[PDB]
Amino acid sequence: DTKEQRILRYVQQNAKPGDPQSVLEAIDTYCTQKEWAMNVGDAKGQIMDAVIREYSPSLVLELGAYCGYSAVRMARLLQPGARLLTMEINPDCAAITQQMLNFAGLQDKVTILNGASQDLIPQLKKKYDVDTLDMVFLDHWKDRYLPDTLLLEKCGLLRKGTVLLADNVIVPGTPDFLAYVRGSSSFECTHYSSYLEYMKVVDGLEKAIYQGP
Amino acid sequence: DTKEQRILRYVQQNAKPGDPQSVLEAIDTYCTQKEWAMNVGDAKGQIMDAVIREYSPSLVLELGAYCGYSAVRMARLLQPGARLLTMEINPDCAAITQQMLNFAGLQDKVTILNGASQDLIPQLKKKYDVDTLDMVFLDHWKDRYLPDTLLLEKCGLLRKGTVLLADNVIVPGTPDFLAYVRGSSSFECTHYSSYLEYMKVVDGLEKAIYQGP
Ligand SMILES: N=C(N)c1ccc(NC(=O)Nc2cccc(CN)c2)cc1
Numbered sequence: 001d002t003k004e005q006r007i008l009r010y011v012q013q014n015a016k017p018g019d020p021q022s023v024l025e026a027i028d029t030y031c032t033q034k035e036w037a038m039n040v041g042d043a044k045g046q047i048m049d050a051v052i053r054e055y056s057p058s059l060v061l062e063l064g065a066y067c068g069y070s071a072v073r074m075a076r077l078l079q080p081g082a083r084l085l086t087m088e089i090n091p092d093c094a095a096i097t098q099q100m101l102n103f104a105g106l107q108d109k110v111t112i113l114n115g116a117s118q119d120l121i122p123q124l125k126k127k128y129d130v131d132t133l134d135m136v137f138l139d140h141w142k143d144r145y146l147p148d149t150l151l152l153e154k155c156g157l158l159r160k161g162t163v164l165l166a167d168n169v170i171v172p173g174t175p176d177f178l179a180y181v182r183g184s185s186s187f188e189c190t191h192y193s194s195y196l197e198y199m200k201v202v203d204g205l206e207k208a209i210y211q212g213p
Numbered sequence: 214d215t216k217e218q219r220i221l222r223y224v225q226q227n228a229k230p231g232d233p234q235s236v237l238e239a240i241d242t243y244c245t246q247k248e249w250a251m252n253v254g255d256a257k258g259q260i261m262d263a264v265i266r267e268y269s270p271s272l273v274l275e276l277g278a279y280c281g282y283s284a285v286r287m288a289r290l291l292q293p294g295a296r297l298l299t300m301e302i303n304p305d306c307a308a309i310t311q312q313m314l315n316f317a318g319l320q321d322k323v324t325i326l327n328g329a330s331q332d333l334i335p336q337l338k339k340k341y342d343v344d345t346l347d348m349v350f351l352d353h354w355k356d357r358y359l360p361d362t363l364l365l366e367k368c369g370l371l372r373k374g375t376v377l378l379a380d381n382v383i384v385p386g387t388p389d390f391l392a393y394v395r396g397s398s399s400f401e402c403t404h405y406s407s408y409l410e411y412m413k414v415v416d417g418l419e420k421a422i423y424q425g426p
């Protein structure tokens with residue numbers, strides 16, 4: 001009986017059907033109460049929104065999904081003609097995510113693929129008629145952030161101005177990923193550190209904008 | 214011949230009059246060439262914009278102004294009925310700032326006050342008929358950031374949701390300012406680190422949202 005399952009359940013019992021905002025609130029609440037995650041709206045959500053709004057991407061790729069919070073958060077802001085593609089290796093998390101999008105009524109803005117990013121990324125151009133990406137959201141599996149970044153490049157999926165946003169990038173974590181995008185001339189970087197009301201970083205996010213090879 | 218005199222000159226010679234974006238582009242382009250300040254539009258301007266857009270303040274107070282870049286950046290986004298108040302202790306910077314807003318055609322959006330923040334702040338409610346502030350932009354003189362913040366609270370000028378944004382808050386600088394706002398429950402805090410394309414932080418900003426006494 002997983003945490004992400006109990007989150008889904010809580011949403012299904014308490015959120016307003018087809019109301020993404022309600023859904024996000026229900027998640028944020030339960031996790032804060034449970035202390036699985038504190039004020040995800042202010043710590044992570046708000047930052048996601050600002051990035052979406054600054055860039056107004058037509059095509060967003062989410063790599064990694066836990067309970068579907070991030071997918072709802074992004075999908076709810078996408079305008080007609082804009083879409084989210086989501087990848088997650090863990091099948092339960094994938095499914096919870098789908099079910100979470102369903103409840104919000106956002107399922108038609110999103111395409112979920114349950115598989116390894118290493119195997120799925122190279123199929124995007126061929127299998128999925130993707131030429132390049134406007135935005136990528138890296139989530140969940142921090143160890144996959146750098147490999148993913150490198151593979152996207154390799155597959156020719158990034159273009160000048162493609163925005164990467166990675167969640168849960170807090171020192172000393174994801175050491176290899178941060179060093180790379182910061183040191184690389186192909187990435188223009190901005191780090192976001194959410195402290196909420198205290199002194200300890202609650203969430204760290206990295207925005208890295210591809211500057212071409 | 215001061216740097217901010219020389220920035221003003223460059224703008225006047227090169228930017229399109231009455232064009233804020235042109236003026237912002239003239240200052241960046243010049244400071245960058247002089248290697249006085251790299252890519253201020255990416256490093257600082259874009260963040261300011263994101264904050265203004267998120268919060269849509271009616272009244273912004275800027276404390277500190279060097280050449281006026283920030284005042285132009287913020288004033289160009291304020292809608293009818295919104296206004297900027299700028300305080301700067303150095304009389305030439307204040308005047309450059311005014312002449313810079315003139316060139317951009319933004320002078321009616323702004324009131325510039327020449328004087329010490331400690332002296333001007335307490336006169337705001339009384340002399341300038343302010344109740345509280347929607348946003349405060351701290352700029353230019355980092356040593357004043359903490360005492361400004363405290364005086365603004367003392368003067369009853371912050372309300373729940375008042376957004377403070379401080380420029381040039383790069384560790385190990387302003388350690389007390391940062392420890393104060395993060396340490397205090399009266400502030401909900403987010404740090405922005407702009408790396409541009411490099412390994413090292415170019416500019417750092419702190420958003421602190423007042424949460425009450
Ligand atoms: N690189 C990682 N951090 C990483 C790599 C691989 C995975 N795999 C799963 O979660 N598989 C899974 C998860 C749930 C259930 C099943 C099988 N039904 C398989 C996770 C994390």
Ligand SMILES: N=C(N)c1ccc(NC(=O)Nc2cccc(CN)c2)cc1
Nearest residue numbers: 302303304305306329353354355356357
């Ligand atoms: N706390 C600070 N960092 C601080 C405090 C005070 C000042 N004062 C001026 O710049 N005065 C000035 C500057 C130019 C000209 C004149 C008077 N003609 C006065 C600066 C910085």
Ligand SMILES: [Cl-]
Nearest residue numbers: 041042045046
């Ligand atoms: Cl929120």
Ligand code: NA
Nearest residue numbers: 181182184410
């Ligand atoms: Na870089």
Ligand code: NA
Nearest residue numbers: 197394395397
């Ligand atoms: Na705080």
